[PDB]
Symmetry: D2
Subunit: 254 residues, 4 copies
């Protein structure tokens, strides 16, 4: 039960977004929500999606996490508008299509660093900026994937970025733990989203999970959301630095 709580949800682009899964769950549970977006087309979508939710207000903020200024200023506004918050759901990554296929060894410098910036470094600065609105502590949750732990065909430059995000989560837990701020990851199973369209072999991935993972089935966004609710609430009070897989057991098998 999340009444009185306020969460910032980062990275809804549309109805299939993992973060929109997160949103429905927290909304259903009683939370007040604030959404951040990058593209104009995403603000429009959010505008249309908020009619499903039970939020009396729409608290929408443009933040491109490639700019320090937009993060600093975006969180500063949030505080002025809604006050102190209880956590942040981070659902943000990017890579060029070029570097999500063929050969990892040909990734460009610029393409490599672009994925680190957006998909890993972004959590450090969000956490720093968010920390200023959690003086009594809170919870930060970032979205990860199996390709950060094992080399998987195609995910290429994103795997190295996911590996980097998961360590980020561990150094942030260590740093922020004395401020009563917990930092964890959800490692979601594969899911049909707009960003998945740039992961080569996606369909085959989806299928190899039905056939082989313990639950013999794929997970959806609402499942990411129910775990996110546990992480973002006091249910998970002893838990930090952790990486929960929501993937039907796939992580546990070979």
């Amino acid at each position: 039960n999340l009444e009185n709580k306020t969460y910032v949800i980062m990275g809804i682009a549309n109805k299939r977004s993992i973060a929109f899964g997160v949103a429905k769950v927290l909304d259903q549970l009683g939370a007040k929500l604030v959404f951040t977006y990058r593209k104009e087309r995403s603000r429009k979508e959010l505008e249309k999606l908020l009619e499903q939710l039970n939020q009396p207000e729409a608290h929408l903020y443009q933040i491109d996490v490639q700019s320090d200024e937009e993060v600093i200023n975006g969180f500063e506004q949030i505080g002025k508008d809604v006050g102190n918050i209880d956590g942040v759901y981070h659902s943000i990554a990017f890579a060029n299509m070029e570097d999500l296929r063929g050969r990892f060894s040909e990734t460009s410098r610029e393409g490599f660093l672009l994925a680190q910036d957006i998909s890993s470094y972004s959590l450090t600065i969000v956490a720093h900026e968010a920390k200023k609105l959690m003086p009594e502590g809170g919870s930060i949750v970032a979205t990860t994937y199996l390709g950060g732990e094992f080399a998987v065909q195609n995910y290429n430059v994103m795997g190295v970025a996911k590996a980097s995000l998961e360590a980020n989560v561990k150094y942030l837990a260590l740093d922020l733990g004395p401020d009563n701020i917990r930092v964890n990851a959800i490692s979601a199973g594969p899911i049909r989203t707009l960003s998945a369209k740039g992961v080569g072999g996606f369909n085959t991935i989806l299928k190899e999970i039905e056939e082989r993972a313990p639950l013999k089935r794929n997970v959806d966004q609402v499942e990411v959301g129910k775990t996110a609710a546990y992480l973002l609430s006091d249910l998970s009070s002893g838990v930090t630095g952790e990486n929960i897989h929501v993937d039907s057991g796939f992580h546990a098998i070979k």
Copy 2:
């Protein structure tokens, strides 16, 4: 909310048993509970404990996990008395105290096997027998410790048995996955319990955690129960074969 759910909690010895921390969390949440004990000492401890809970009736069954017949007959009686269950919290381990100090290279065959039998195998037989009471799926959660993943001075025979338990969970997850039964482990930070009096240098454990772990404080049994509630419920659908550390982040630092 766990109303009209039913869970079998295994291994409460006294007010301090981790498992009693599980029991309060689920009782609060509206679940019907059923308890199993090994020895009278606890039958009587349990009498008095359950007046602190809101269980309108006390369902208590004596099971020693060294006996197939008692594991088998116990669960059959549970079902005739209570119908189908939603899950099982397993909170049982044992070693001989000589094998919890000194040199691991000295462990006897009897002592080694005693710890595997009780602390590991028992989850297999329990899972086989509870499956019979979970025709529509359910959740099973065992209690493990960081000594299963790393060598820690003194824990010795228990560390190898805990590593064996944690694989036990992965192999049960894969097996029962297709029956909609999920199997996970909670990895609890150090807690002053009865069994914990048997481990060598347990005091220095507690303090090493306060000083060094990200949250810079110790966990308690209620913190286990809360996470156990997450695991035993629909919030963790899509999560199986997993091991959630509830240990102030200590698993994640070196």
Copy 3:
């Protein structure tokens, strides 16, 4: 890597395809003195004829069933008299009932479970405690494990919990015996066509998945495990203890 003046006990050759026979060809070729332990009379017969191919002056053959404290304590004691002090042990022993090696892991008997723990895991602890007696100036112990000790792999069932237990054992033995200058490590071998492999449901499927999916797109052999053993049993690995080296075409790094 030069192995003259060095003596290693190899535990678990049964025939020419044994993984331990790979270890043996490498060690011998590097000039170490070898001492062999077997359980079944048939294994020794097989060792006797395999020895012809090695460059060993004499057979050092000892019957040790690791299920017996006496056989372990007396064999090591008897080895350390025939040859004196030693340098390392290659451990290569495991067993599970075939019933417990296919179908449903939730159906495993207590008996078959403890059987697998006893033979395939406990034996490491007691062998090291006896082997230590013969390594006053230090040494090196290596056991043999499988990816199934680290993930739930189909069919492998009771043995994967046994390997899980093997792995922690190696780590705990490393912590225990480090001050004594004794290292303890594991090789995690990819699937190899052997006698014990016959008991593992789905084996041909396993090998084929490696060829199709592991980074080297091929299967490894006994000699390849052998080569890494030499590393681990010798002073190139000084510094390395409690390690688990995967010799598997890189299969462990992918999903």
Copy 4:
């Protein structure tokens, strides 16, 4: 071992305590031809004076700042022209601002973060791409990591995250280049008095924690690191790829 007729590229010697200098004396001793790459004019000077301690008939030195694609591309193309095909590459290169090292991790700057990724992680990818051109029948690439890549350690901050990245790079490089017969691995070294260690808060208490807690209850040296390098860079390690072999007294194995 036997590295006569092999040629390796060693990147990252700065002085006589460079970890890569460990690597070099072992390779040299094992009979390899060696080619060394450097960034700062001063390191080239130190190398020329370190080459005297080695059995190297010819000094092959190449200026390579891994921040520059054209510098890696041209240095490798040049190496190929002066020695022919090579057998492997020891990579031993990392960098981060003290500014970003001795802080609260959450206060790390963007440019600081990406500088560490660029130098310490991305450069393996490009080295590997250029080095492949000189390994038409295969080879071996080794990079140098640190336990701080697997858990959050005090003070390591920006570098542990770069190391986490380095450790994914190796796995992805391994999977991508396996078919070409190129193995790719890391050594996770324990701590060691080096020029670069001077950037790391609390280094003294880190050396002393290993001493009091790692199963060997002592610290390792460059030379130990080198001996595992030899194994990884040679055919001893043929089944092995995408591995992280820890040369740290067993510290990784404990809590």
